[model samples]
Target chain A: LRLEKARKIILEILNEKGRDALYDLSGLSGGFLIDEKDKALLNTYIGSSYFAEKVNEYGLKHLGGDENDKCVGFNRTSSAILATILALKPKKVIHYLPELPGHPSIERSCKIVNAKYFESDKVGEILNKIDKDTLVIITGSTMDLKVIELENFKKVINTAKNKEAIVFVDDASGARVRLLFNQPPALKLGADLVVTSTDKLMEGPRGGLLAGKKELVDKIYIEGTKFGLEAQPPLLAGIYRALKNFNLERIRKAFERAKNFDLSKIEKLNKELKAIDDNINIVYERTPTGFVIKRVYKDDTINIKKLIEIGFNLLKNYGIITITVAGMPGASKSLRIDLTSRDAERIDDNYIIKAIVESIKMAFKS
Target chain B: LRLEKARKIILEILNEKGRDALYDLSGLSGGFLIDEKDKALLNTYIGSSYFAEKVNEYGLKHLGGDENDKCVGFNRTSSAILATILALKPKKVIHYLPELPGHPSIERSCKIVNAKYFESDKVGEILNKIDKDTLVIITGSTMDLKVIELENFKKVINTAKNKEAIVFVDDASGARVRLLFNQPPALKLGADLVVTSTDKLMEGPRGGLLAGKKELVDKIYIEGTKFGLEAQPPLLAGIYRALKNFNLERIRKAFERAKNFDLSKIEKLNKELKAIDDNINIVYERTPTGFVIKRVYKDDTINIKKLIEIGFNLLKNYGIITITVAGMPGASKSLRIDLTSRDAERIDDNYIIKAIVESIKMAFKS
Candidate 1:
């Protein structure tokens, strides 16, 4: 619930208990895989580089853009979306996804720009909501791993374009996912622009990469850079390395782990584990990496207090870091047992499953 | 004047002329003095650091804050200032600076929040403008090398305190300027928060270091991090090294260079140099590190078109990067010849003056 407080607690724990006191399962751990030669370039005065521009080169390649397209890296997808909306300043914004609500950042970006915003899951409603000078945002994949059908995605863009509206795809994790596993790149579907996360499913730093037609992206860059919304050179270097060293094989193996992740038990926490087994509902769904377990049956906020409590118990009892406990307040409220994270590679998958179930039981200890 | 276009032209030259194409005199080149051991930490998965916290430790030392005060690093001083104003959404924002105009980002932040804003150099007008829930912003030093009087500084904070307004100081260059050269830290004057640039006059990465009351800073951190406003890990490491290796002796020697900076001329550009001597303003005053030459005597934007023209000529002819031309469009309109930069170490001081004068001459090259 507390972003700063969470950071402070981690720091406090770090000081007293050392770095090993906490472990990350946030699935958000970024990697800096640049070579030593690149580290020398880190000394460059201003945070711009031709070398790092290749990140955008690869960025556009992943997003299915050619030389006619441009790319800008932001500190986060949050910055990119905000800058895009601010630069365009549409009269209204209509977002279509696999569910009722989308990322809060989209709505917040609209709020800051003083634009009327609406969100829905139905394609017909979205198509009907189109107005001239509007912005149509397509969520390539939801926080809950919900993916929209490709036919509907194209239809929304076609409808919005006919209405003289511009389209932006918040591809975030879906950038790689949609390309490799789910569907076609947003640009191919006539989406005006597409922004994706460098780190979510990939090993890059936590930053946003925007790719689109040069005229639109250049305009966005002019606004974004003015607000200091672009990523610094070091992050750019990290993105370059991350993209250069990206692996599809590891992602393929992640599916195997998801299938075998559920077999586990703990002796001391047997009763505690049973308590959660009876109370909390759970189901599995596939994401960019593989299948993931959702805490509530239908992503309701009913047991969120207990959800965080479970997250806390996992952190306090073991070093299992989940988004629920360690996430910023505006971070995803849907608690998912992310077994595809970097932590899953080192930490025992069976132990992680046990820890997750055990911690959920701790919510009813009193 | 276009931020992206300026970079594109620079890159275009860099591509054609090679790496030695442009030389930096922007006085904003940040040095990543971090040690080899620190590069290992760049792989720390997440962008949080205990070592980087030492930057904040030194940051508080520079700002005059005790343990009660906290610090946060931003991508730029613009980010820090925006987050501060946004975090503390005041009823009114009354800014007191050395001159009438302060940083545009400050006013823009107030606009984003729909807060009433007023700016003035007169303390009486500023004091009268203060109301309940107001944010009193003090510019310790202006972008034009203007520093406010110490007596006026405390008076604004005192009056704002009486009105229950939270005082935040935009001490960009003045964090070091005030403490090492002019006045006391803003925190000592009872200001609630203070932010300074790590790169403006210091050999650090381009970033903002915010040090102030923990409650206010923590609140700011909550909001800032949500928008991904904090510095990434590599930047944090750079700040740590820059802070750790900060040398006052180099800053001391800079004043010596300023005294000896203006001498000599070139024969080929004698007529060109004479043209500039008749126009642009000529005056000298001390800043954190000695004196600087501002182009316009009254700090007016009247000759700014020529100012950047002068900047571009210098770049085209000899590759000397000045803020006037190379700077982002929103950068200071007042052109300045900054001799107290890292480039001064290698480039001849006398030749720099010649190039500056000659560039201004080329501005009227009809």
Candidate 2:
């Protein structure tokens, strides 16, 4: 079979190019035989043999880092949180969902689990109103001011603990970019449980990841198996590959690659777009690892279709077809772009700026 | 390269045998041509694509019939129900999920989407509590009563329309085996949307199938793409294969095979087990499609380890490993002997019963 041949070829390539360093499926047990000669790689307490140490290390360095926590990995965060709630059968699972025009699944999960849904903004008031028996689920990523505001985090954590309420931190967004910097685990950040998606940022497939106190994790694993939703080993292998890519030297290079001139140019183009279109706003901020831009607009009045068309054209015109810009609603009408390390040299700053300037003019005129 | 070659091989196989079927990447559409004559042998919906159809059909057969008073097809039943709820965006989507015991992920999509959860017994009352503005999801297969238990089915439909509510049915189980007979679609049974897993009895691959109104199906498709959780194309191919098999009357044969078994022989073995040890219970009820016996005992005192050891020993003793006896929960002390079409011979039957009796006796002493 072609598949068998491919596997053989891949093995031959690995044999020729790799030393004993080729794979560390055992995570911390193997450490980074390919990279470092000494120094033991530390695996997190809530880690698994199924997940590579390098990948978890990558996650801790990047997404878990204080400044870049907002990139919660993927939607699996909500899935895991809901499962935990179901298995634990808590009196109440409190979630901060404000009917936001985002993944409806989060709101649906909270409602389906019979959890009390509270708007993010009103969470403080709701927390004061509910008893300690309610399990509080924080829905925002590190990027949200509400989440970054430690005072508020402590307030919710302390109040929930006071009421004997279970606390679940959903790190869906943060997981996507967790390999770039060092940050505390969500559990260490005061959550009794942290649920994430291995695929989004973790480079795994679509499935939920749960971590917490060993006891809780064990119970969850049992219940999860009982529920017949155990993660497949092959999919788990993909996560290992992703984590391995998050090596220290490699991660540093990835960061450098992201900070290359093209991103700066893209930021400038965003600025130009904002100048021409009053409705367009870009939330670009420099983190330790790289830069992230958040889009905010008054409403969905912006000509995103035209903007996407122009941006895509610019990417294609330069013989660069890898760039992607998405139309998403949160604070306002906006577009989010990730200047990945792979796209570093392929894109030029001048072209980015020109693309944005021309796009704004065309969109606004149309 | 290997993939290319494998694809070529597959194409060659198809070309040498027949070329009447046009393969859709997602198995969403197909027009089957029969034999070298080039005549269109069938025009059924392709694999997994017809999953929604199966769910709709099963729902109708079990629930009564569709809202329009016409017989609901599989696709129509599934799509309309899902579409109705999605379009309405009801205030709440409630469902009873008793852990389903054996079936996992039956309620996964709902959980993924965040819907209200409750026990099955409470579904009718929950529907009553929620105004017409709400949506209620109920899993019918796990419930003891047939999905469309006439009185309850009518009450829910009449309640939904009168209250202006929407009801979505999760008929993941029955839908799998729907086409085993000329069963009606579940949508006709009055669910606004019906979702089913395509693989099981439907003989597709592992994937989810949603069917209902065009409006609802369209919205779900949009949502699925947006969330990047769309099913794979190959999975659709599997569904198509299953559909083709269904049309060819293979499914009906499977049902027939289960019916013509020597029930008296199995019954005698059940009596022997009970005489020796009252702990074992045999389930020989006439299911719509197949026959199965599940062992049940008082308390949770079944020694599964002993039973498995004895069962394996029996496997060696009989020179046959076809029959399987599992240690399920209170049912763990018992083994389920499946009367599948594959086990058509009297020797196969005798081999299975002998193993069960020997294993039980060995386990009883242990």
Please, what are the lDDT tens digits per residue for candidate 2 over residues B166-203? 66666665554443324455676666666665434444
What is the clash tally of candidate 2? Answer: 66
lDDT tens digits by residue: candidate 1, B1-366 = 234444555556666774445556666566555654455345443346555467678777767898899877888888888778778888788888888667788887787789888899888888887877788888898545568888888888888878888888999877766655558888988889998887766777788888888889999977777677778777777777777767667776786776654433333344444455544444434444433444532345655566677767777777676676744357555445555665566677656766766765566554
Candidate 2 chain A, run of 10 with poorest lDDT:
A37-46
lDDT of 2 by residue, A1-366 (tens): 011222232234345553221211101111111111100000110112223333334444543433222122221344355446557766555565323434555455455456655545455664775466676766545433123344565677778778777777666644333323344556666777666665343333344555565566556655544333333222233344455554446445544644663545555655666666666654556544344333334354444455445434433332222112223333222333333332332344564456444544454542
Model 1, A262-350: lDDT tens digits are 53333234443445455445544555443334553333564566667666677677766666675434766545555556556767776
Which parts of model 2 have CA positions greater than 4 angstroms off?
Answer: A1-75, A83-166, A173-181, A214-251, A260-366, B1-171, B176-179, B188-191, B204-208, B214-248, B256-366
State which candidate has the highest TM-score.
1
lDDT of 2 at A219: 68
